[PDB]
Design a protein around this ligand. Structure first.
Ligand code: HEM
Length: 151
């Protein structure tokens, strides 16, 4: 339940992400791995990255980051009516990448932390609150799909 007004602030912030998705994507993943290092273990391609300097140099990290944020933007733009963009995501993350719902909370916070560090003048009190409700709706739908898949 975001109001139209909140969907709008979400989409205005998202616009800044879209002017550089791969740079924001890389920062988001280095923020999650620095803050919850155990999340790094689900990424077989990144098992072996040892420093922030190796994460910054990694070509595959830039790509997964990019892919992650392109898929999130596609959902957000649906404004809550994302059942179909969401199912395949839940299927893959539940059954193949095996991501627990808590990890969805860690990535939500890295996303907020990156928007906050990069766009402080555009990520005021209002945009913070709208963004945060949108990520929460996203986690709650994911969790519901998980339960339904029997996980
Ligand atoms: C914003 C929430 C997320 C979105 C939108 C997202 C999106 C995606 C997409 C679109 C793919 C590629 C296709 C697929 O396998 O479904 C992918 C792959 C993957 N995701 Fe996520 N993801 C999210 C959260 C996470 C989290 C929190 C983790 C682990 C902590 C994770 C782990 C993985 C792994 C291990 C892969 C395979 C990557 C590879 O080596 O190519 N995802 N993700």
């Amino acid at each position: 339940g975001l109001s139209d007004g909140e969907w709008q602030l979400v989409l205005n912030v998202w616009g800044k992400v879209e002017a550089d998705v791969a740079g924001h994507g890389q920062e988001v993943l280095i923020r999650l791995f620095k803050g919850h290092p155990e999340t790094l273990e689900k990424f077989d391609k990144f098992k072996h990255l040892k420093s922030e300097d190796e994460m910054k140099a990694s070509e595959d990290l830039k790509k997964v980051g990019n892919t992650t944020l392109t898929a999130l933007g596609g959902i957000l733009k649906k404004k809550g009516h994302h059942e179909a963009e969401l199912t395949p995501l839940a299927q893959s993350h539940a059954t193949k990448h095996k991501i627990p719902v808590k990890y969805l909370e860690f990535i939500s916070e890295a996303i907020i932390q990156v928007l906050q560090s990069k766009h402080p003048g555009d990520f005021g009190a209002d945009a913070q609150g709208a963004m945060s409700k949108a990520l929460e709706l996203f986690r709650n739908d994911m969790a519901a799909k998980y339960k339904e898949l029997g996980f």
